Amino acid sequence: TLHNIITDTENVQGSFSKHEFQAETKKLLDIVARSLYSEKEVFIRELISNGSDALEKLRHRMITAGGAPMEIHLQTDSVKGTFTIQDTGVGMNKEDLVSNLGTIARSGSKAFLDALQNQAEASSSIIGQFGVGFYSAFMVADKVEVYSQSAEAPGYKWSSDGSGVFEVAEASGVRQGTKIVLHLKDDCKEFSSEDRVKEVVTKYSNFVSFPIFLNGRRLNTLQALWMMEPKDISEWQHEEFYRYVAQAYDKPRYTLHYRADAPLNIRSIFYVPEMKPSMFDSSVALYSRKILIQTKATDILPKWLRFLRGVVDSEDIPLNLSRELLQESALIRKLRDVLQQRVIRFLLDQSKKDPEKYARFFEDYGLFMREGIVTTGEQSVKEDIAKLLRFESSALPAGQQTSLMEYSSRMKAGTRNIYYLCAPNRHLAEHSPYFEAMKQKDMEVLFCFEQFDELTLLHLREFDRKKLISAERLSSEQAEDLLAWMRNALVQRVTNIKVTPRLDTHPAMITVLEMGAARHFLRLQPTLEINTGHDLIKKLHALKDSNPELAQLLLEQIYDNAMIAAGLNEDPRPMISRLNQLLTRALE
Amino acid sequence: TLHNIITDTENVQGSFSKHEFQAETKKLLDIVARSLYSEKEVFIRELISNGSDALEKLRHRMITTAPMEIHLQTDSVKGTFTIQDTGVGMNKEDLVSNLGTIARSGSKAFLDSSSIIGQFGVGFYSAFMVADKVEVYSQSAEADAPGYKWSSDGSGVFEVAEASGVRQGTKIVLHLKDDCKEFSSEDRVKEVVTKYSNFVSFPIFLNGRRLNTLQALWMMEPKDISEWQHEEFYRYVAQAYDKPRYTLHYRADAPLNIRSIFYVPEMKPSMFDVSRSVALYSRKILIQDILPKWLRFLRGVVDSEDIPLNLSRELLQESALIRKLRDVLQQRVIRFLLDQSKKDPEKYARFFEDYGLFMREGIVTTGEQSVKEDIAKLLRFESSALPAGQQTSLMEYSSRMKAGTRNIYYLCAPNRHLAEHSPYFEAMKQKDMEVLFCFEQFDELTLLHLREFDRKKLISAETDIVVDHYKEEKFQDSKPASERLSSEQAEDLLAWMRNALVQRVTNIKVTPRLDTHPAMITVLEMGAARHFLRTILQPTLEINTGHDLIKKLHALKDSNPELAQLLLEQIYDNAMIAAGLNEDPRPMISRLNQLLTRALE
Ligand SMILES: Nc1ncnc2c1ncn2[C@@H]1O[C@H](COP(=O)(O)OP(=O)(O)OP(=O)(O)O)[C@@H](O)[C@H]1O
Ligand SMILES: Nc1ncnc2c1ncn2[C@@H]1O[C@H](COP(=O)(O)OP(=O)(O)OP(=O)(O)O)[C@@H](O)[C@H]1O
């Protein structure tokens, strides 16, 4: 029932020829100047990047052959519609003008990197690699003019329109550096506006090492903090940087400055906002050699760590030809694993340095850990994230938190079972029929009140090589006569009316068998328990026959009071109208 | 004060020399095979699309009969991926010019329909990402041509030799490198085909078995698609098991080219996925926002011939068109959802009950006022001029308003019975205005961010009651003066209440606007006060001197003064609960139980 035509029937017949690969140049220029970048505004990023490379080469030459400042200069002409950019770097002679700008995929900045020592400072700051970034000017310009003056012993002019030809001629007088003039298109006249160009520079090239002037005014007044020593950075510097990199306006409660040299080069700073996120609403930016690649990174961090803010910079991460994506690499997948373990080991340290501060962190961002244990499919990671979880216990007072490592610490030496009971509040967990069995023979049980706590431990399955298993006055006849009267007035409200001695001050309480049904009600088969020794109960027994219309309101109120005290009713607005009627009839 | 270097000073000296742009071919192939495509798997997509182009060149050629299909074979033992199509094939000249030249595309000179995927001329070189050796056997059409074998290692050179036994078409054999042994697996290759090339207009065979290629339903007439076809297509693009309750098949040619299908799942949206969706295609090939954040519940596919692709075929090149395309789709979905309330209001009442949280998000998280009001047309409330259970909208509220009115009054309550008997509604019934009833949790937060609708201000009932104090309090009680406390008995009672509620209320005043309730708490910005408590204030207690509970409170302060204070604290708590401003209602049960005991003798 199969059908395939691929068969080994071909054989080499005769001799063969030899040819080299070619390249249609006229078509290739159009590819770079159109179908390469998702935005037209990219040309500003590349021309500034090519200028910074020219500035870095001159700085490196002045180390051994030391001899004006550096920095790059821009200018916009809103009338003629021209975008001009000029650096005062190394420049280019006539040979380097025809070789570099005239040949696609040729990058003199790449050959410069391969000739330097790997310890040289310019070896980790040159941006060029491929050799096509310059041709992004033809995407927004009908005519490109380049003036350059080399640092050796005449200036030249490089002019082209992007149609497969260019002209070179002498010029005078060209300043030491390289000047580029872009006669913008009609649909690209927005790039002659000082405001629009300023928006583009602050997006990609805001952290260039050298100063950047726009019509005579400096822009990039911001320094890359992820490149400095974590000790020489003050707290007010991180607070000022977090508001920029995260587009927020508060202070980062946690700050992680990670610097590693084992997988590639990691110069990253992570933040945790102090304000809790909500519905009425950036992420971690990806830089490479101080240039923005992705505003919201996708491959370097897991999904459950998207609440982190900051920036991750890598000098040797495989970049895409568009400089806005990353290549599929085993180095990037291992980078995500190292970062996941570092953030876990970092938040664990904050839980020991300040449990009070970590408890505030787990209340706001605790849902991300519960999301991580469920989403991931690696069991060793599910237990690494579980070390961050916090729960209340049955053998501990209310309001105090403990970890799964603390629970396994206090367990009996002859047992290896983690027992938990996920209930709404504590009044429903302490009065659980499945917990009362674990209160006699068995010992400790975890109380998980937070949302999505059940399926988190259900997807956790195993922790610390151990299983998590969900642990799931009035006479004797005067009460029964009152019981039979309460069941008839509460037919379709509760399913069982009991009498228990544990009440004293409260005339009633609400206990529920299954806690999964208690959450579905809060999205039910309650058990109303009555104290035959309370004042309101003995008044209810005496008013069920003397004033049945008055005892009907009291019964409905005692049930509602037990529902509120049990957390089942948090908005007692429906009872206000009936409660006011009870007070007036009780104050006659 | 300024520092500029650029000055018009350069002048051309001597004549110029003309040159031609050149290309470094050895490094061009290195860029394609390493730094062009972000994911290695796309080499299967490019080779399949090259076979679909060759088959389309034969489809157009057969109309001046042979099988037209694509075959894939995986050899995990020899580490070999083989693709063979029965298309036009290439002669010796085509093998050297089309394949041996970067950026050269024979699928461009073929011009003179819209079923050819080839464009740039570099897609064939995507095989070198995963293969050390590429063998290509091609046979031209019925013509004066023999068979040939195209061979290359991927480094600068290639060899072409004549071959026999070359079937009509083209066969490419990829000797996979050890880095990419995943592509010699049948399961892995089938994942790549169904991802990118699941809508190819030709059959695809993998190791002998025919792959279930689907049909591009977004490129066909809507009136030729049955409900059962939209069911099966929704279960694929959304990867679901249910069926869509709504189906929008929107096509357009102005101002943009749009060929899209949208679905609304009949399942309620999982609350775990809301805090934690529509594909994009082009020429039946998968491409990887397009819809606003509040429309993330919709599932489907959007196609547009006006969206340019990049070289790697994974990026959209017009962020302004994407922003314009997003607004056009938003207005269409708004009209589509508005037409669903007209045809079946009961079904839309279910959809608004399951997805209404998305429409409220799109109103709060939007800066444009007109977008706030366009989405607001989808909201549904109940009116005080309509029977219980009947839903209405802001549009229907605006038509009922008289010529003199200029505001839209609304009231938020848990259910209908509380809104009809709310103390804030009894004060509104003295007016002749219509009041909307909002029962959802985040309805008041939405109407505060909406602010106005159709130049009419949204005023909550609790706010309008506070404003009338600063105007003419020309209202009258529901009971005659014989049933109320006298002015001497009222001031004597008001002074005692200010002393027992010193630091809990700003001031206490009498109001003639209550009938059933003894008191109510009024705050100016009541809507924001309820939102701020979801983590004191300046509240105002307004008593009803005709209520039996207040008249008894005036007498209790002289017969049982401690019982009167416990009652006053309870009236304040009840007025705070009914206002939605109550904190934790559990610590008050103690005083309530103690108050009910002393009252019941
Ligand atoms: N402003 C400038 N001053 C001096 N040299 C320059 C300038 N701009 C470009 N060049 C030279 O021209 C060459 C062409 O660079 P091109 O922009 O084509 O690629 P790249 O910048 O090296 O790398 P990428 O293609 O990744 O941007 C570079 O190697 C560089 O040495
Ligand atoms: N299997 C095949 N049979 C016959 N002709 C082919 C085959 N594959 C490619 N060709 C021809 O050789 C040319 C080589 O094109 P190539 O695959 O390199 O890029 P492209 O598909 O034209 O461009 P892009 O992939 O960027 O759209 C094509 O134009 C096509 O006409």
Short mmCIF file of N, CA and C in Angstrom, two decimals, chain A residues 12 16-22, chain B residues 25-26 29 33 95-96 99-102 124-125 127-137 148-161 171-177:
data_model
loop_
_atom_site.label_atom_id
_atom_site.label_comp_id
_atom_site.label_asym_id
_atom_site.label_seq_id
_atom_site.Cartn_x
_atom_site.Cartn_y
_atom_site.Cartn_z
N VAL A 12 26.89 7.93 -13.24
CA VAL A 12 27.66 8.97 -13.90
C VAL A 12 28.10 8.47 -15.27
N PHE A 16 33.14 15.01 -16.49
CA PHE A 16 32.49 16.12 -15.80
C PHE A 16 33.31 17.38 -15.97
N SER A 17 32.64 18.52 -15.83
CA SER A 17 33.27 19.83 -15.90
C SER A 17 33.46 20.38 -14.49
N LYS A 18 34.11 21.54 -14.41
CA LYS A 18 34.38 22.19 -13.13
C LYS A 18 34.04 23.67 -13.25
N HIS A 19 33.22 24.16 -12.32
CA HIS A 19 32.80 25.55 -12.31
C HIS A 19 32.84 26.08 -10.89
N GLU A 20 33.05 27.39 -10.77
CA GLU A 20 32.97 28.07 -9.49
C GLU A 20 31.61 28.74 -9.33
N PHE A 21 31.17 28.88 -8.09
CA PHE A 21 29.91 29.55 -7.82
C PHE A 21 29.99 31.03 -8.20
N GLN A 22 28.91 31.54 -8.76
CA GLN A 22 28.81 32.93 -9.19
C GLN A 22 27.83 33.67 -8.29
N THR B 25 32.14 35.54 -3.28
CA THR B 25 31.26 34.37 -3.39
C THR B 25 31.58 33.33 -2.33
N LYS B 26 32.86 33.14 -2.00
CA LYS B 26 33.24 32.13 -1.02
C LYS B 26 32.63 32.42 0.35
N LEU B 29 28.28 32.10 0.36
CA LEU B 29 27.76 30.79 0.71
C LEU B 29 27.95 30.50 2.19
N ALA B 33 24.85 29.49 4.62
CA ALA B 33 24.89 28.20 5.30
C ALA B 33 25.10 28.33 6.81
N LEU B 95 21.30 24.15 -14.90
CA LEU B 95 22.02 23.70 -13.72
C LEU B 95 23.18 24.61 -13.37
N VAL B 96 23.81 25.22 -14.37
CA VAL B 96 24.95 26.11 -14.15
C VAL B 96 24.50 27.53 -13.82
N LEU B 99 21.48 27.26 -10.43
CA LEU B 99 22.03 26.74 -9.18
C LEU B 99 23.42 27.29 -8.89
N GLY B 100 24.29 27.36 -9.90
CA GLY B 100 25.65 27.81 -9.71
C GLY B 100 25.86 29.30 -9.62
N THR B 101 24.79 30.08 -9.49
CA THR B 101 24.88 31.53 -9.39
C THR B 101 23.99 32.01 -8.25
N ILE B 102 24.60 32.61 -7.23
CA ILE B 102 23.85 33.14 -6.11
C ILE B 102 23.00 34.32 -6.56
N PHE B 124 17.98 27.56 -2.58
CA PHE B 124 18.56 26.24 -2.77
C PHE B 124 19.78 26.02 -1.88
N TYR B 125 20.53 27.08 -1.59
CA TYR B 125 21.74 26.96 -0.79
C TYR B 125 21.46 26.72 0.69
N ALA B 127 20.45 24.06 1.85
CA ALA B 127 20.76 22.67 2.14
C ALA B 127 22.14 22.52 2.77
N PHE B 128 23.06 23.45 2.49
CA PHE B 128 24.40 23.37 3.04
C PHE B 128 24.45 23.64 4.54
N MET B 129 23.34 24.08 5.14
CA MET B 129 23.29 24.19 6.59
C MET B 129 23.45 22.83 7.26
N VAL B 130 22.95 21.78 6.61
CA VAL B 130 22.81 20.46 7.23
C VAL B 130 23.53 19.37 6.45
N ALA B 131 24.08 19.67 5.28
CA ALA B 131 24.66 18.65 4.41
C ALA B 131 26.09 18.99 4.05
N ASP B 132 26.96 17.98 4.09
CA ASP B 132 28.34 18.15 3.63
C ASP B 132 28.45 18.00 2.12
N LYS B 133 27.54 17.25 1.51
CA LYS B 133 27.58 16.96 0.08
C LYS B 133 26.17 17.05 -0.48
N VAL B 134 26.04 17.70 -1.64
CA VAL B 134 24.76 17.89 -2.30
C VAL B 134 24.86 17.32 -3.72
N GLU B 135 24.04 16.31 -4.00
CA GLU B 135 23.95 15.72 -5.33
C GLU B 135 22.60 16.09 -5.94
N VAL B 136 22.61 16.54 -7.19
CA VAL B 136 21.40 16.96 -7.88
C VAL B 136 21.37 16.27 -9.24
N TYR B 137 20.34 15.46 -9.47
CA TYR B 137 20.10 14.81 -10.75
C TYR B 137 18.86 15.44 -11.37
N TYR B 148 21.72 14.79 -16.28
CA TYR B 148 22.93 15.35 -15.71
C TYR B 148 22.95 15.12 -14.20
N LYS B 149 24.16 15.19 -13.64
CA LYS B 149 24.38 15.06 -12.21
C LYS B 149 25.14 16.28 -11.72
N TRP B 150 24.53 17.03 -10.80
CA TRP B 150 25.14 18.21 -10.20
C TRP B 150 25.68 17.86 -8.82
N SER B 151 26.97 18.12 -8.61
CA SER B 151 27.66 17.71 -7.39
C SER B 151 28.49 18.85 -6.84
N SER B 152 28.52 18.97 -5.52
CA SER B 152 29.29 20.02 -4.86
C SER B 152 29.47 19.67 -3.39
N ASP B 153 30.58 20.13 -2.82
CA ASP B 153 30.83 20.01 -1.39
C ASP B 153 30.35 21.21 -0.59
N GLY B 154 30.01 22.31 -1.26
CA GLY B 154 29.62 23.53 -0.59
C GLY B 154 30.72 24.55 -0.43
N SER B 155 31.89 24.33 -1.03
CA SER B 155 33.03 25.23 -0.91
C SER B 155 33.47 25.66 -2.31
N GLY B 156 32.94 26.78 -2.77
CA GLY B 156 33.37 27.41 -4.03
C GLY B 156 33.14 26.76 -5.39
N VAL B 157 33.32 25.45 -5.51
CA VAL B 157 33.29 24.79 -6.80
C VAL B 157 32.18 23.75 -6.83
N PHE B 158 31.82 23.35 -8.05
CA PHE B 158 30.86 22.27 -8.27
C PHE B 158 31.14 21.65 -9.63
N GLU B 159 30.73 20.40 -9.79
CA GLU B 159 30.96 19.64 -11.01
C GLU B 159 29.65 19.13 -11.58
N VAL B 160 29.55 19.13 -12.90
CA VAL B 160 28.35 18.69 -13.62
C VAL B 160 28.76 17.64 -14.64
N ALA B 161 28.11 16.47 -14.57
CA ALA B 161 28.39 15.37 -15.49
C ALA B 161 27.08 14.81 -16.03
N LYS B 171 16.09 15.29 -8.58
CA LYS B 171 16.33 14.61 -7.32
C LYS B 171 17.55 15.21 -6.64
N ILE B 172 17.38 15.63 -5.39
CA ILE B 172 18.45 16.20 -4.59
C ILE B 172 18.74 15.26 -3.43
N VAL B 173 20.01 14.88 -3.28
CA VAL B 173 20.45 13.97 -2.23
C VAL B 173 21.37 14.74 -1.29
N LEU B 174 20.98 14.82 -0.02
CA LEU B 174 21.73 15.56 0.99
C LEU B 174 22.39 14.56 1.93
N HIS B 175 23.72 14.49 1.89
CA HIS B 175 24.49 13.70 2.84
C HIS B 175 24.62 14.51 4.12
N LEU B 176 23.77 14.21 5.10
CA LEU B 176 23.68 15.03 6.31
C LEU B 176 24.98 14.96 7.10
N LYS B 177 25.44 16.12 7.56
CA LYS B 177 26.58 16.16 8.46
C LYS B 177 26.19 15.59 9.82
#
